[model samples]
Target: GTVDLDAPVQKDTAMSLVSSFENSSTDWQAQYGYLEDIAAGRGYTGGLIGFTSGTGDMLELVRAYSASSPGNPLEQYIPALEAVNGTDSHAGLGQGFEQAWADAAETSEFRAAQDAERDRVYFDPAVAQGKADGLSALGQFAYYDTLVVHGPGSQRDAFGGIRAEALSAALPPSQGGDETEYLEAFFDARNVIMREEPAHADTSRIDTAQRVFLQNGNFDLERPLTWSVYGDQYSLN
Candidate 1:
C-alpha cells in the first residue's frame, strides 16, 4: 500500500490559513502592502511571509527582482538593503524605503518575488522534509508553520532544534514509528520554543488550530474546517 504523505490541500488555501495565523487574516492581498518596524529588531517586516530587511532574505529577493528587471520598483533601495541585511536596526530605511516597499507591493514583480522566495526558502524545503518524515498534510503544515515562525535555521530554537527533539523521542512513521505520536512530540517541541519568545508566546495557533485538526483525525486537512488563533475563528470550505 502506498501511503499518501503528500500535501492534500492547495498551496493557496494552506498559505491563506497560514496567513490567518501570521497576520490574522486569510486575505493575502492585504498583507502585500503591510510594512512595519515592529520592535522585534528586524527592520521593516512586510509582505506575505513577513520578510524582514534585517534577515537578508528580503534584500536578496528584491535584488533578484532588480537583476531580472533593471527598473524594478525596489531597485532604488539597494543601499538600504546593504545597511540592514544582518542587523535589526532601521538604518538607511526612512520614508523612502517604506514608500518603495509599499510601491513595490502593488507590482507583479514584487508579488512574484515573495512567492518565489517563500517557496525556495521555506515552503518547498519544509514540505520535502515533512514527506521524508512520512507526515500527512496536517503534519506537513506543522512543519511549515514552524519554519515560518522560527526560520529554517538549525539553531537551538529553530526548525532543526525542534525536529531534533521530536526525533529523539520517537522515530517518524516512515521510520516505523506511530504517526500521531511523532506529530505530538513535534508540537510539544514547538510549544517550548514558542513559550521562550514573547512575540510567539501565544501557542493558540498550534493548540487551538493545528492540534484540533490532528485530534479530529483530519490528517489530510479536509475542508469545512474551523479553528481559532489568538481567539479569532476561521473556516475554510
Candidate 2:
C-alpha cells in the first residue's frame, strides 16, 4: 500500500502553527505517532476505526495537559486531523474505536436494549408520523425521496427533520433576494426527499449524533459539488 508520510507530519505541523497563533502548545507528537502506527505503511489502510480509537487516548492526555497548562491545544490539533485524513484512509481508526466500544457494550449487556429503545423512542410510528407531517409542511416529495435514497436520513427516522431544524437555525437569515433564493433552493433540495420518503428522509438511529451531513452541496450552485457520507457502519448512504 502507498503511504503519505508527509501528510501526517504536515497536518501536525499545521496544527502546531495554528496552536502557536492561538498561543497554545504544539505537543501533538503522540497524535502523530498514533497515526503513524495505524496508517504509516501499516496493514490498515482504511483504518478510520483504529485512528478513532487511538486518538481518544491521546486526546485524553492532551486534554489533561491542557487543563494543567495555560494552553488549550487539543482543539487545534483535532480539527487538523479531520482536515488531513477524514475519509476512508482513516476509517481504520473508527473501526478500532468501535471494536473497543462493542466489547464494552457487550459487557454492559445494554446493546440489545439500546437498539430496542432507539427504535421505540426515535423510530417509532409517532416519530415517523411527525416526520411525515414536517415533510408535508416542507412540501417537496421527490426532493425528500432523493435525499433519503442517496442520503443518510433514509436509514433512520426523524434525523432529517432534526437536520432541517438545525440547519434552519444555523443558517443566517437571507440577506437579500439572491441569498433568500439560495436558501430556498437549499431547502428545496432537502424538500425533495422529505416529500418522497418522509420516513426514510431521516438518518439512522445508529448515527449517535443524529446529525445530517450534506456534503459537496452548494447553496451558491455556482459549481458542481461532490462529497461522501459514511459507508456502512453508522449511516447508510
Candidate 3:
C-alpha cells in the first residue's frame, strides 16, 4: 500500500507536538472529545486533528464512522454536514449535534475512524512525500505539520504551492541538494504564504519552532526537543 506510519515513539511525539499547536497542550489524547467553533471561520473545529465542519474533514470522519459502525449517534448529521461542507453555517447540526459528536468520540470504533481518517488523509501522504524527497524524520514532520494546515490542493498558498515554490528555490535531497538548504527554502516559502492571511500571521510555527530545530540540525527530531509557538514554550524531552 506504500502506507507509512512514523515509528511508534515518533508517532506519539508528532501527536504531542501537533497538539501543542492545535490545543496548546501536549495531551493530544484528551482532544478526542474536543469540539468547538473557535470563530476562526472554519466552523466547528474538533477532534485530535481539528477536523472542521466547514472543511469537509468532519464529514469524512462521520461517513467513515457510519460505514463501519452504522447507526451511530452522528449518522443523523450527515445531511447537514454535506450542507455546511464549504461554509461556516451550522444549518442541520444543532446544539445536539455537538453532544452527539462528543458521545461518539467516547466509542473505540469512532476513535478508530478518526485515527484512520487522519492517517489516510494527512499523515501517510506527508511522510511518503518527505521520504520520496529523501527527508529525515524532522523534515517529514515539517511536511506533515504544514500539510495539515495548508492542505494539499494547488491553491496559491496551499501545501502543493508551497512545495512548488520551495522547489523553485532549492532541490530536494533526492535531486542532489542539501537537506537543510531545501528545508529552509520550504520554510521561507511557507512563511511568505502564511503572512498573506491575517489569521495565520503569526509565523512562530516556523520562525521560533521549526527554524530552531532546523538551525540546530535536529534533522532526526530527536528527544530533548524544545520550541515555542504563539509565544508559548514547549519541550518534548
Candidate 4:
C-alpha cells in the first residue's frame, strides 16, 4: 500500500546496548542522524522501495512541505487513518518506531490466512494440473521466511520449527546457497531479521545474528542495511 508522504515521521527511541560494540566511532549519532533524515525527508534508493513496496512519496511530500510551509501534513494523515481504523497510525509504532518495534506483535492469524490463500490460489490448482508447480512446503516456508525476516510479529518462534529440508528442495540454486552453508545461512539470516526488524527490546537475537552474518559474509549484512537506506528490496543469499 501507499504510505502518506506527509505522515508524521517517528523515531526509534529505544537505546541499543550493542551500539558501543559497533565498529563505527559515532554509531549512535550516525543511526539517529540517519533516522532523523529519514523522518525529515531523505528518501532511500529505488530498490528498497520495490522490496518494501513503498511508494517513495514521503520524501517528496516532505520536500513539498519545505517549499510551502503548511501545518504538518502528518497531522492530517494521522487523523485520516484514525478516522477509518479507529486508532491513530502512531498507536502501534508511536509515530516513528515502525521499523523498531515490529517483532513484538502477533501475526499467526495473518500468516495463516495468507497461507490459506496461497493454497487456494496456487497450490491446490497446481496439484490438479499435475505440474507440481507452486510453493512446495519449503516454498511455503519461504513465505514465512520472508515474514520472519521482515514481519515484526510473535509468530517468529514458529520459524525454528519450519522444516528447511522441504523448503530447500525447491529453491533455485541462484536463490539458495551450497548445502554446507545453506542451513547456517538460513538461521543466520533469520537472526538478521529478528535484530533488524523487532518491535521490542529483546534484541539479543538480532545482535548474535549480526555478528554471525558479519563473520560469514559482510556483503550479505551490508546488502540489507544499505538497501534499508536506499533500495526497496534485499536478499541474504
Query: Which candidate leads the pack in lDDT?
Result: 3
Better of 3 and 4 by lDDT: 3
Candidate with top TM-score is: 3
Error of 3 at 12 (Å): 1.2
The list of candidate 3 runs beyond 4 A from truth reads 1-5
lDDT by residue (1-237, candidate 2, tens digit) is 021112343223322322221122344222222222333222221111122323233333333333444333233443433433423233333444434333423322223333233233322432243233332211122122222223224332234553455345344222222323333444444444445664334333112111122222222111121222223222111
* Cα lDDT tens digits for candidate 4, 77-108: 43332332422123322334333212211233
Clashes of 4: 21
Clashing pairs in 1: none
After TM-score superposition, the amount by which residue 132's alpha carbon in candidate 3 deviates from its true location, in angstroms, is 0.6
- Kindly provide the TM-score of model 2 when superposed on the true structure, using C-alpha atoms: 0.20
**Which one wins by lDDT: 1 or 3?**
3
Worst 10 residues of 2 by lDDT: 205-214
TM-score of 4: 0.23
Model 2 ranges with Cα > 4 A deviation: 1-86, 91-98, 109-128, 131-237
Sort by TM-score, top down from the best: 3, 1, 4, 2
Collision pairs in model 3: none
lDDT (C-alpha, whole model) for all candidates: 0.83, 0.30, 0.87, 0.29
Cα miss at 159, model 2 (Å)?
7.1
